[PDB]
Nucleic acid binder design. Structure first.
Lengths: 204, 178
DNA sequence: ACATGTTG
DNA sequence: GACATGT
């Protein structure tokens, strides 16, 4: 096989916009306790900018027990429970209380395991087409909160051979909401990808 | 208009379970100092069967006595003394019937009709019921009553409390559905 | 007790 | 709807 090295601190240590963009095309890898490796190529992300960002958990420099990850070293995972039963997987970027949410993966490996995991918690485009869908598919839960994506043995990021060029990256309004921050183009996805959670035609 | 009287001692002077069930479909009325009348149909209650505290004296008074207490230093719960040593019924939810706009300004996001009275503390806020109501008599008070029309109220579910919680089956106004 | 925040 | 979290 090819020489494989994980993306580390150097990759994660950039501001939220460039990081959210840089994630696109990179391959998120999960290794289950049974040894099964799950891979999904990132096709959709969102930037949360920090204190000024009315939509961010870190609005006004607010640090709470839950959102510790957003204020930890870049690369630190911030995984929280939303609507009681779903997870959102974020990665702390450079910048006070700034992070990147992963929203959608093209599944590459272990699709049958992703299917088993999600059906318990059917189509391939249904597996990772959403921030909480992808968490289920890759057995990611709160136990991953505050772990380091640069160093962890169970989850890591690999440089992916297929990165979108600037013109192929769509910038669009974020999903799930405010004010001027509900409309800001802080969601980024690969143009024409069928794995993306929500298409935005006006932005395209 | 119809000949309206109010429910009195005879209605309230029953055990906590019969009364908690009997409250469902009755209309609670609150008249504000400005003359505005607020109305809400009781759709969810809880019976408390008793075993004496400086705060629970209300539930140890004659049936129909209000027991209103502060919880989490902010909210209110409205309870009505029934027959039985220390027994009472909590009001948990109302269907808002009139004065909804007042209910909204008293409660004030954008909140809809289903958010006005869908909770024991929501309903007290909505009907301006506070501590100054504690130990008042529901059968005789001038600011708050349980009205009685020429028609009886209109299906009751007995569930665990939040089988001593009772609510109108499938009502969109019940706080928590089992 | 309340207010509020993706999936299907 | 969840139900985890933040006066």
């Amino acid at each position: 096989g090819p020489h494989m090295t994980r993306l580390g601190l150097e990759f994660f240590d950039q501001p939220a916009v460039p990081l959210a963009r840089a994630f696109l095309g990179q391959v998120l890898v999960r290794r289950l306790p049974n040894g099964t490796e799950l891979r999904g190529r990132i096709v959709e992300t969102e930037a949360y900018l920090g204190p000024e960002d009315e939509a961010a958990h870190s609005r006004g420099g607010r640090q709470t027990p839950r959102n510790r990850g957003m204020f930890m070293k870049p690369g630190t995972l911030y995984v929280y429970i939303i609507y009681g039963m779903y997870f959102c997987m974020n990665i702390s970027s450079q910048g006070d209380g700034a992070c990147v949410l992963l929203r959608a993966l093209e599944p590459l490996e272990g699709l049958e395991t992703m299917r088993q995991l999600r059906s318990t918690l059917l189509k391939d485009r249904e597996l990772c087409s959403g921030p909480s869908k992808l968490c289920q598919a890759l057995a990611i839960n709160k136990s991953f909160d505050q772990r380091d994506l640069a160093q962890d043995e169970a989850v890591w990021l690999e440089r992916g051979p297929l990165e979108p060029s600037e013109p192929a990256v769509v910038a669009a309004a974020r999903v799930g909401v405010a004010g001027e921050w509900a409309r800001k183009p802080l969601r980024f996805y690969v143009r024409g990808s069928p794995w993306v959670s929500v298409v935005d035609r006006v932005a395209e």
